[PDB]
Symmetry: D2
Subunit: 164 residues, 4 copies
């Protein structure tokens, strides 16, 4: 029930990382960053929706690595984070830093989501999509409910940080 409360009326985005290190840093530090165009879209979504849920997948892994709620709009951030940037990209191109509240840090293999389709991506399987693909409400809710419950996470701390 607590997870479903967190997910009520949420918007869902599929976030694809080229490597494991960025998702590991996000789990360790509770933060996320991206290019300004995407940052703008996330900030708009954050102000417009009861919750914004990021569902993370490392390409070539065949799995989702967890999901998290946007905790606030982006801000300047602290000391540099050693993100692993795509070949040739300068860290000077990154925007601000989002604080994220992890709801599940456990993995879900794509084999377990093979029955779900995203109406907002031509009913392709929900694993399929470009970085930032939005997942329709009911599909995104079912996908999140497929993850194993994460006993290392206190959903009350997630619920307390909600300001809807």
């Amino acid at each position: 029930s607590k997870l479903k409360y967190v997910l009520q009326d949420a918007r869902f985005f599929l976030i694809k990382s080229n490597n494991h290190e960025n998702v590991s840093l996000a789990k360790a530090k509770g933060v996320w960053s991206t290019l300004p165009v995407n940052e703008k879209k996330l900030n708009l979504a954050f102000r417009s929706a009861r919750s914004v849920i990021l569902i993370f997948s490392v390409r070539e892994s065949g799995k989702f690595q967890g999901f998290a709620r946007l905790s606030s709009e982006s801000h300047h951030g602290g000391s540099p984070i050693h993100w692993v940037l795509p070949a040739g990209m300068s860290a000077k191109m990154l925007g601000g830093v989002f604080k994220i509240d992890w709801i599940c840090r456990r993995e879900l293999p794509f084999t377990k989501s093979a029955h779900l389709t995203n109406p907002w991506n031509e009913h392709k399987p929900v694993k399929i999509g470009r970085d930032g693909q939005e997942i329709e409400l009911e599909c995104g809710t079912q996908l999140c409910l497929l993850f194993p419950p994460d006993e290392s996470i206190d959903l009350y701390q997630v619920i307390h940080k909600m300001r809807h």
Copy 2:
């Protein structure tokens, strides 16, 4: 006295634009933008100082065009603004949008500031500096006091938006 109150313990930055259009848009809309690296520095300065004052100069103009107080940290912004970007730069590289409260929208020719030197730039005349050059407290205060008073601006509205 009101202007001096606004300037108390402020930090001052010299902001140089390649063209008039960006400063005109900033006066019309009460906003400013820049690349993320600079945005980060302005956001940090905003949280650290009683006031952050931007002093604007259009290159090749021989003048300052006015000065404004940072009103808040940067945010996603509204509809695109038709900023005039340097040749070859994508608007996708810009960070968020700062709201600024204009304190003076009138010009000051460089000839009138020729007696002031910036200790934080090797005592070069205060007109001299790369974009973002910081101006020492007393020098920056004297420079702002050289501008003609702007009767079109209500300093009470500036003072009311201060949250120190």
Copy 3:
């Protein structure tokens, strides 16, 4: 023998694309592009090595899609190419265009290269690597020899464009 001739003393790079579209365009038009940092690295490699071989893999495909020889240093480009760019990145950030001479446009599944490890990447299977990972001479040679012969390609045309 013709393939082994082209590959003599070659340098090999694993090129990872996040979508099929860019590799399909490269196959149709015989060109490639990327960010200026990587463009510089490819131009340096082209000028010094007898051949530079790009081995392409679309992430999440579980296959290599083919491989090609760099035919020239990068140049202006000519006609526009509707590359698919990472979210939030501008085509204005891209460097010039390389002419590439395809050697094989047929696919090779990762299962077929399970016995090849790359000694310049910690002896990990050669399918593993960040974008641009260099592959040691003998490992890259054997990987290219694993691809099925591509009758649609005239290796004499590839060989005749060599200027060693």
Copy 4:
């Protein structure tokens, strides 16, 4: 006569730098660089025009610092060049390096060109223009002829590098 020969049928571009350092480096090393969008435009102009002439002006200097002929399309570069970059921009964003053949390294004050208007920029004085502004043939020719002869330059070396 030698100068008029070099300038026959040339295209002329006004290049505006925000600091003296970049123009000083260009004069010392005989090279130029810029963002890929502008690099593409310069490479196109080089391939089609008999000569491409870059006329340099450091903003706020009130002078042109000299002019040079594009000697080649852009290339990798070679040795590093410690260009001064706009605040917040990364050297990784820059394109390749153009070889330039200086024709005059002596300065021309704007007061000396007050009679030349650029018909491809609304008949504004030729000193006026955004970075990269193209200058009509006869106006650019007369502007270059206004510079003082530069005995330190051997125009035969410039002429011998022409490949029209």
